[PDB]
Amino acid sequence: QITYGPIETVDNEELTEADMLSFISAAVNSTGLIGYNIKSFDDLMDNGIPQIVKQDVNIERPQINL
Numbered sequence: 001q002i003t004y005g006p007i008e009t010v011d012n013e014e015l016t017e018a019d020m021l022s023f024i025s026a027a028v029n030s031t032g033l034i035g036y037n038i039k040s041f042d043d044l045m046d047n048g049i050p051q052i053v054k055q056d057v058n059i060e061r062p063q064i065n066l
Contacts, residue, residue, distance in 0.1 A: 045059065
């Protein structure tokens with residue numbers, strides 16, 4: 001039950017096509033140039049490997065550390 005300013009109130013006629021590229025920049029910065037691959041590997045190692053081996057064991061950093 002949270003409202004927002006009236007639609008007619010918003011004043012963005014000055015907005016230009018070049019300005020919208022700020023949105024693209026924000027999207028790329030947040031998501032990143034590339035991602036979700038290291039994320040999938042990390043989630044696997046953290047949860048799937050324990051969950052999968054169950055059906056406690058964990059892998060430490062590769063090693064003398066290399």
